[PDB]
Amino acid sequence: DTYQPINCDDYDNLELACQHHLMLTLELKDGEKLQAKASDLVSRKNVEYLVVEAAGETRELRLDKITSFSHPEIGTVVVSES
Amino acid sequence: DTYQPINCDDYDNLELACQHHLMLTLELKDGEKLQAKASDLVSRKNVEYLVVEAAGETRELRLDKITSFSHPEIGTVVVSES
Amino acid sequence: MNLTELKNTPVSELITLGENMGLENLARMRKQDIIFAILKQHAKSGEDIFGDGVLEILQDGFGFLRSADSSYLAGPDDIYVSPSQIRRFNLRTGDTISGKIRPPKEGERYFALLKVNEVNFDKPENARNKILFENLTPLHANSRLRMERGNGSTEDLTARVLDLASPIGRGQRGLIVAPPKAGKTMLLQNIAQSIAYNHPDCVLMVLLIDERPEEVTEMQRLVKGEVVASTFDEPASRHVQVAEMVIEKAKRLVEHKKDVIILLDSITRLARAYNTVVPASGKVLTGGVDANALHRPKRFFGAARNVEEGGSLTIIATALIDTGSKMDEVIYEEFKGTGNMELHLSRKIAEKRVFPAIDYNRSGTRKEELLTTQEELQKMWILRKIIHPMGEIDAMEFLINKLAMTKTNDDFFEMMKR
Amino acid sequence: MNLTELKNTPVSELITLGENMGLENLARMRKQDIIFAILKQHAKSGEDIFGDGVLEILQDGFGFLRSADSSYLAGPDDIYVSPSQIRRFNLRTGDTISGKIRPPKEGERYFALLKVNEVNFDKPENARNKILFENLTPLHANSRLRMERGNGSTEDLTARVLDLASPIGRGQRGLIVAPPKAGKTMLLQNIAQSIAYNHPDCVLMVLLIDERPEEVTEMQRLVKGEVVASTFDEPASRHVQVAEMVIEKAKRLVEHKKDVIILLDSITRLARAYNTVVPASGKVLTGGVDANALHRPKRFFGAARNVEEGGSLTIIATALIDTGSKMDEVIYEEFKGTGNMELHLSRKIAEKRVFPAIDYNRSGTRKEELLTTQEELQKMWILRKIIHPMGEIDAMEFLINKLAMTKTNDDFFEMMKR
């Protein structure tokens, strides 16, 4: 319901991946897999969104719904819901 | 019963063995021949302790109870009481 | 544990806490190193660590959450915030940030922020939507900050004399011409207590520039509120940093519709520090002051204004006169007409050991019709009229002994008209 | 034997002792080398050797135990302290370490420490649990150091005038402004004598910067306590090292709840030496003085404080004016208002041959109510009121004449009262 901003370290890592523009792995709350590219992270109306595309779709996604991520260069970090 | 600070030369030789990670042959107050691998020492409650991972159990002990320490490479130094 | 409470405990308590926690060799370290070691040892357990501070933004882009307990001094206990958070939440210099923190990782020196909980004593969403201080329209002071204690004690006598001499309003720009050995320090002390008593809502800020440590300790002990200081041991860059941090914090607090009072001690020392720290411009006036040097303190002094939208920022500074150095004489000379409130102190009154040493015939305010009422203004002008022909020290002692038996101001006026 | 007694032994006796031991050609060798050879031979005999010294930690991390007999001058007789001992015992610069020493081995040209026995005149265990000097909370001076010997001698006249003019408190930051040939040396000497007489418990320190060797020997012979100095034929780095060692030792002594007094002559020479040694900053003030160069002397001069927990560090420094060089004038100007005690010597009084040449009107203290009693303060105020209107030379001659016909200050006060 009410949106909760993500932790500082997780946000920093995600925008580090954004500026590096590296291929990324996305896990939703149900536990699925999306091999996709993150383009930018945009905050609008006190809610931040990230644009991520599998084939150039540029889909806007919330930051709290993200479960985890993994890439060999940067160790995997699991976000905290509370 | 009260711990006595050891002489400067003995402490310097022991720390040299610790930093250089030499193969220490230890002779205790009783005279027990031990194969001690010295790594580091700590000071707690104004008393100096030396910790050795002999056979991986990592035992700590006092410094006033050591009669002698020797090494095939470096010159052996007898612990001076004065 | 909370960081802001670790910085308030005495050093002996911190040492005992570190010793019973399992740490050693903590006695010979500085307070900040002790705090950092204790925090690292606690975070080794993995518990939640809270903290708070004022954000200072460096030239490179990242910022540090300095603490007011150490007068915004750099140290190993400061929390490091990457430009990530400055871009995410639109944070300027002086924003009070409070939230959770984490121990540094490998290759990281200072602690890092983990989750912001409050910005400028407010939620981040409401904090990011506030109008900047520069966009706020200045106005004349209209609401008066009455600083009469009302208890009738001998300490309130100087406050009553000051109120009769020059009223103080919210957002007023105050300047005190204090010659040496004129009891300026105790005047600031009683002003601080009067403000802390009469108006608990207004945020009180006392900053000391180029002062001795004993004055710093006594000001911290007796003045209730926030007190920062910069002793003469520290270089001029420290004075510049302290002044900039305080003024930025004051502006950010005023943006949230709050009343802020800043007692500057003193303006001449800040101007000298700015002159020392500024690059040379090639044009140097008399006394060795650079033309571009004196412009920097004007940003501090010009920030005093009454915000029309809400709240105000008032700066009651003091200057140094006839101290023997022509540099301070020039600094006072250029700061002459830039303040609507002027308070003149004199050496002749102080050398007679009668306090306060206010020169009533030459000290006053501008646009005082807004601060006071009609009959109060009439009585004040009548009192000034009768004082005017009398001698300086004579007028001072006449004011003192006329105010001796009186408890308040209005009854003094009634017995004056009689 | 003991290193300290050897360093205190006269050179001829050292030569005779060395010849008796079996040495030769010691007559044309430096005293330090004589002591080094004697110690090496006595170590070859095989006996235990004691020694002591104040620790100076160098850039790498090892330390040297300098001796106060040679004003902490680097020499072959200094004791080498390996970084292992500094990590084992938490020792900082200025720590006074006394213990057994060890003969140098091949490849080493310094004696090495063997077993520490005393640190800062205390057991090694208790020395590691003393809070740092910086963390100690400063305070105002409240306990007075009485300078009046009271024996009625003519030498006590200057001390009595000191007590009448500027009371001295434990932790008072004193500045004595002295023009040339105004009898400053006799004033410092009398102050040191009176302090060593009245208060034997407090540690007395005399610091001389850029002084002729005859003055150094005079201070060494006459002043009770210990005196270190650096003659003008030494590099500025020598003055810097001497001052830093003195102030570190004073801080380490204050840490152990002791009262230390440092008489410095002069602050101007120390500031000039610091200016010479410091790297250039790019900003040069008037008179060719670096800006940041004055940050170091203040950290010295500002170390004077009255520690609330216990102890005290009282620094009285002499400043030089009228010397004809703008550097001295600007150095004085920067140090204008950082001292609790001010004392102005007068060339005009000195040329009239009356002593001590003290300007009563332009001298005093800050917050003198704490040191003295109520009746004494009232009497002093009466005296200052009486003296102030008249001339300067007349004031000093009147004060001397009135103090001459009485022994103690109290009797003079009663006589003045009548």
Residue numbers in the entry:
A (entry chain d), B (entry chain c): 3 to 84
C (entry chain D), D (entry chain C): 1 to 418
What does the paper say about this structure?
Bacterial transcription termination factor, ρ, is a hexameric, NTP-dependent 5’–3’ RNA translocase and helicase. A ρ monomer contains N-terminal (NTD) and C-terminal (CTD) domains connected by a flexible linker. The NTD comprises an N-terminal three-helix bundle and a five-stranded β-barrel, the OB-fold, that forms a primary RNA-binding site (PBS); the PBSes are located around one outer rim of the ρ hexamer. The CTDs jointly form a secondary RNA-binding site (SBS) at the center of the ρ hexamer.
We subjected SEC fractions corresponding to ρ-Rof complexes to cryoEM/SPA in the absence and presence of the transition state analog, ADP-BeF3. Multi-particle 3D refinement with ~600,000 particle images yielded two cryoEM reconstructions for each sample, corresponding to two ρ-Rof assemblies. In the first assembly, ρ forms an open hexameric ring (ρA-ρF) bound by five Rof molecules (Rofa-Rofe), while the second assembly represents a ρ pentamer (ρA-ρE) bound by four Rof molecules (Rofa-Rofd). In the presence of ADP-BeF3, we obtained a ~1:1 (ρ6-Rof5:ρ5-Rof4) distribution between the two classes, whereas in the absence of the nucleotide, the equilibrium was shifted towards the lower oligomeric assembly (ρ6-Rof5:ρ5-Rof4 ~ 1:3). The reconstructions do not reveal differences in the ρ-Rof interfaces, irrespective of oligomeric state or bound nucleotide. Rof molecules are bound between protomers ρA-ρB, ρB-ρC, etc., but not preceding or following the terminal ρ subunits, ρA and ρF. In addition, loopβ3-β4 of Rof contacts the N-terminal three-helix bundle of the adjacent ρ protomer, presumably explaining why Rof binding is only observed between neighboring ρ subunits but not at the terminal subunits of the open ring. Thus, Rof bound between two neighboring NTDs of open ρ may stabilize their relative positions, and thus the open-ring conformation.
